[PDB]
Amino acid sequence: AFRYTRSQSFDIFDINQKCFVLESPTQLVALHLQGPSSSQKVRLNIALYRPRGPRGSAGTGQMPVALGIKGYKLYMSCVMSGTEPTLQLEEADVMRDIDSVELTRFIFYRLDSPTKGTTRFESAAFPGWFICTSLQPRQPVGITNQPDQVNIATYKLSG
């Protein structure tokens, strides 16, 4: 279904200028990181994939990516927890091939708006669900089917 093409490292902020920090090995939180800080901003290793597949279904395309938490040996994934879609961080190595519905948990569609300089990330495993931050500081990064509605689901990436 997906085949690895390369990885590139990016800085990331949400549209309100919050960055990510890894508050514990299972929780990424978003905050205005400022003044003095012990806290190390998270960068992303974005692994770009090419399809040979697999569908369906979705609501998105056409840059499938995995999102590595640079330096911490984690990748973001979307899974069901209880009965709710959930963003989690998993100890996973770099995946050359994503060729099962299980491994599709790691794939997001990077949706850039070339004009505005902005990006959304839609889950491939949970179409219509997007990576989001709270309007409040120090809350976990998560996923939502209401992108940008009393959350922020729009980011600025920089190489």
Experimentally, the structure was elucidated by X-ray
How many angstroms separate the Cα of 148 from the Cα of each of 121, 140, 152? 12, 15, 4
Dihedral sign, CA of 136, 29, 113, 79? negative
Would you state the structure tokens that stand for residue 17, as one six-digit string? 């200028």
Range of the domain at 8: 1-159
Angstrom distances, CA of residue 112 to CA of 85, 89, 109, 142, 157 = 23, 23, 9, 19, 10
Resolution in angstroms, to 1 decimal, for this deposition?
1.6
* Tally of structural domains, the chain: 1
Sequence-ordered list of residues with C-beta below 8 angstroms from that of 114, at least 6 positions apart, any chain: none
Q: Are 82 and 98 in contact (CB under 8 A)?
A: no
Instruction: Write out the two tokens for 74.
Output: 């984690």
- Give the domain CATH number at 42: 2.80.10.50
